Design a protein around this motif. Structure first.
Motif, PDB file in Angstrom:
ATOM      1  N   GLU A   1       0.495  -1.467   0.558  1.00  0.00           N
ATOM      2  CA  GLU A   1      -0.110   0.234  -0.053  1.00  0.00           C
ATOM      3  C   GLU A   1       1.093   1.198   0.197  1.00  0.00           C
ATOM      4  O   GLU A   1       0.138   2.220  -1.005  1.00  0.00           O
ATOM      5  CB  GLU A   1      -0.971   0.427   1.188  1.00  0.00           C
ATOM      6  CG  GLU A   1      -1.193  -1.475   1.391  1.00  0.00           C
ATOM      7  CD  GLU A   1      -2.976  -1.311   2.473  1.00  0.00           C
ATOM      8  OE1 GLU A   1      -4.110  -1.364   2.408  1.00  0.00           O
ATOM      9  OE2 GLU A   1      -2.207  -0.620   3.983  1.00  0.00           O
ATOM     10  N   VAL A   2       1.912   1.259   0.433  1.00  0.00           N
ATOM     11  CA  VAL A   2       3.117   2.125   0.561  1.00  0.00           C
ATOM     12  C   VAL A   2       3.322   2.485  -1.142  1.00  0.00           C
ATOM     13  O   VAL A   2       3.243   3.981  -1.255  1.00  0.00           O
ATOM     14  CB  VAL A   2       3.947   2.158   1.836  1.00  0.00           C
ATOM     15  CG1 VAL A   2       4.906   3.149   1.318  1.00  0.00           C
ATOM     16  CG2 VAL A   2       3.059   2.682   3.165  1.00  0.00           C
TER      17      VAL A   2
ATOM     18  N   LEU B   1       1.280   7.232   7.748  1.00  0.00           N
ATOM     19  CA  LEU B   1      -0.404   6.644   8.402  1.00  0.00           C
ATOM     20  C   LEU B   1      -0.704   5.651   7.474  1.00  0.00           C
ATOM     21  O   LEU B   1      -1.011   4.422   8.954  1.00  0.00           O
ATOM     22  CB  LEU B   1      -0.735   7.795   8.272  1.00  0.00           C
ATOM     23  CG  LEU B   1      -0.618   8.689   9.504  1.00  0.00           C
ATOM     24  CD1 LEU B   1      -1.210   9.921   9.064  1.00  0.00           C
ATOM     25  CD2 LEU B   1      -1.259   8.008  10.860  1.00  0.00           C
ATOM     26  N   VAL B   2      -0.047   4.922   6.496  1.00  0.00           N
ATOM     27  CA  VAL B   2      -0.556   4.397   5.852  1.00  0.00           C
ATOM     28  C   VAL B   2       0.141   2.477   6.658  1.00  0.00           C
ATOM     29  O   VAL B   2      -0.369   1.663   6.711  1.00  0.00           O
ATOM     30  CB  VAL B   2      -0.197   3.694   4.210  1.00  0.00           C
ATOM     31  CG1 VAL B   2      -0.157   2.248   4.225  1.00  0.00           C
ATOM     32  CG2 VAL B   2      -1.072   4.704   3.794  1.00  0.00           C
ATOM     33  N   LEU B   3       1.547   2.822   6.916  1.00  0.00           N
ATOM     34  CA  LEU B   3       2.862   2.041   7.664  1.00  0.00           C
ATOM     35  C   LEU B   3       1.973   1.881   8.913  1.00  0.00           C
ATOM     36  O   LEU B   3       1.283   0.501   9.146  1.00  0.00           O
ATOM     37  CB  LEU B   3       3.758   2.339   7.671  1.00  0.00           C
ATOM     38  CG  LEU B   3       4.567   0.867   7.595  1.00  0.00           C
ATOM     39  CD1 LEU B   3       4.400   0.076   6.894  1.00  0.00           C
ATOM     40  CD2 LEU B   3       6.356   2.364   7.536  1.00  0.00           C
TER      41      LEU B   3
ATOM     42  N   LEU C   1      -6.949   0.979  -0.698  1.00  0.00           N
ATOM     43  CA  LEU C   1      -5.683   0.521  -0.955  1.00  0.00           C
ATOM     44  C   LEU C   1      -5.630  -0.751  -0.919  1.00  0.00           C
ATOM     45  O   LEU C   1      -5.089  -1.972  -1.459  1.00  0.00           O
ATOM     46  CB  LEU C   1      -4.965   1.707   0.013  1.00  0.00           C
ATOM     47  CG  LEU C   1      -4.589   2.192  -0.224  1.00  0.00           C
ATOM     48  CD1 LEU C   1      -3.953   2.544   0.348  1.00  0.00           C
ATOM     49  CD2 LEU C   1      -2.751   2.121  -1.275  1.00  0.00           C
ATOM     50  N   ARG C   2      -6.689  -1.266  -0.572  1.00  0.00           N
ATOM     51  CA  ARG C   2      -6.791  -2.922   0.617  1.00  0.00           C
ATOM     52  C   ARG C   2      -6.854  -3.823  -1.086  1.00  0.00           C
ATOM     53  O   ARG C   2      -7.611  -4.694  -1.061  1.00  0.00           O
ATOM     54  CB  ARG C   2      -7.790  -2.967   1.209  1.00  0.00           C
ATOM     55  CG  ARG C   2      -8.032  -3.695   2.378  1.00  0.00           C
ATOM     56  CD  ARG C   2      -8.664  -3.826   3.663  1.00  0.00           C
ATOM     57  NE  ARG C   2      -9.934  -4.781   2.536  1.00  0.00           N
ATOM     58  CZ  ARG C   2     -10.931  -3.607   2.912  1.00  0.00           C
ATOM     59  NH1 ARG C   2     -11.394  -2.438   3.153  1.00  0.00           N
ATOM     60  NH2 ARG C   2     -12.074  -4.745   2.025  1.00  0.00           N
ATOM     61  N   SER C   3      -8.199  -3.014  -1.697  1.00  0.00           N
ATOM     62  CA  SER C   3      -8.786  -4.102  -3.387  1.00  0.00           C
ATOM     63  C   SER C   3      -7.766  -4.257  -3.914  1.00  0.00           C
ATOM     64  O   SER C   3      -7.328  -4.626  -4.557  1.00  0.00           O
ATOM     65  CB  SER C   3     -10.244  -3.424  -3.970  1.00  0.00           C
ATOM     66  OG  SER C   3      -9.461  -1.845  -4.776  1.00  0.00           O
ATOM     67  N   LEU C   4      -6.746  -3.204  -3.560  1.00  0.00           N
ATOM     68  CA  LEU C   4      -5.631  -3.155  -5.261  1.00  0.00           C
ATOM     69  C   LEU C   4      -5.140  -4.097  -4.782  1.00  0.00           C
ATOM     70  O   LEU C   4      -4.312  -4.868  -5.193  1.00  0.00           O
ATOM     71  CB  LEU C   4      -4.424  -1.926  -4.956  1.00  0.00           C
ATOM     72  CG  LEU C   4      -5.707  -0.957  -6.130  1.00  0.00           C
ATOM     73  CD1 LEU C   4      -4.652   0.152  -5.725  1.00  0.00           C
ATOM     74  CD2 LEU C   4      -5.878  -1.355  -7.052  1.00  0.00           C
TER      75      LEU C   4
END
Ligand code: Z8G
Length: 253
Positions: A96-97, A160-162, A209-212
């Protein structure tokens, strides 16, 4: 716990960690925007074998993920966590990052991305046989670029993603919760100070992000079934650990 000035040092410290662990410099990326692959060079990539394209792309993803591990290391409070949680966070965040960071190498005027020295469109990756995932990757980069991120913004948003306390497997959940809160405050303070709070509602939603990542792992489980020996012999060992150890070695370094 944290106070102001303490929360302001964090903003500077999170931007520094990101500036350092950049795969490509933003200035050099905008400089190469004019270096678009020829219709012949594009055809070369389209005529490559599916497994040669997939292993070329797997190597590129691994290289990018390796910078995200380095970023995580220099991230204030991250290496102060336990090693289990560090692997939990990277094994969810890292992809995601990368998917966020890739917007700096996407040109929205010609709908292209910097790949192997030059900018090319969606059609460059046609040999992969996952047009839908390519579309989703380009569309995600398109929406993220429309925010017109600053280097500080892209830095705080990726930390924050991490740092997410909602990750299954966290042993010291409350320790991560405290860091996520300090990083949320730091991000919001910078947006406040720079009069950029508007982007908060414009940012990508929870499952985007979770769907990718799920699309990526669905499309790899598909390739890996057709060419399992290609994955073992020609895929990087960090790629296989994250998507099919290395992380322990990179962490203690
Ligand atoms: C700044 C920099 C270097 O550009 C960067 O951060 N790159 C990122 C790391 C490599 C790269 S890419 O450029 O090769 C790429 C590939 C397809 C695209 F549509 C767009 C980009 C990449 C490579 C493979 C995959 C797959 F999921 C996919 F299947 F999509 F190809 C894989 F192979 F891993 F499964 C996805 C992505 C998306 C993120 C970028």
């Amino acid at each position: 716990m944290a106070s102001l000035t303490e929360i302001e040092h964090l903003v500077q410290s999170v931007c520094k960690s990101y500036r350092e662990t950049c795969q490509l410099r933003l200035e050099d990326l905008l400089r190469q925007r004019s270096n678009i692959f020829s219709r012949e060079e594009v055809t070369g990539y389209q005529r490559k074998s599916m497994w040669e394209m997939w292993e070329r792309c797997a190597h590129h993803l691994t290289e990018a993920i390796q910078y995200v591990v380095e970023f995580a290391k220099r991230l204030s409070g991250f290496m102060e966590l336990c090693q289990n949680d560090q692997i939990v966070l990277l094994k969810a965040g890292a992809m995601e990052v990368v998917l966020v960071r890739m917007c700096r190498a996407y040109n929205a005027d010609n709908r292209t991305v910097f790949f192997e020295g030059k900018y090319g469109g969606m059609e460059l990756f046609r040999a992969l046989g996952c047009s839908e995932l390519i579309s989703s990757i380009f569309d995600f980069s398109h929406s993220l670029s429309a925010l017109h991120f600053s280097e500080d913004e892209i830095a705080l948003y990726t930390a924050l993603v991490l740092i997410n306390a909602h990750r299954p497997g966290l042993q010291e959940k409350r320790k991560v919760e405290q860091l996520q809160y300090n990083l949320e405050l730091a991000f919001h303070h910078h947006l406040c100070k720079t009069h950029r709070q508007s982007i908060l509602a414009k940012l990508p939603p929870k499952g985007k992000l979770r769907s990718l990542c799920s699309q990526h792992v669905e499309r790899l489980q598909i390739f890996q079934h057709l060419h399992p020996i290609v994955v073992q012999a020609a895929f990087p060992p960090l790629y296989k650990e994250l998507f099919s150890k290395i992380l322990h070695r990179l962490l203690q370094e």
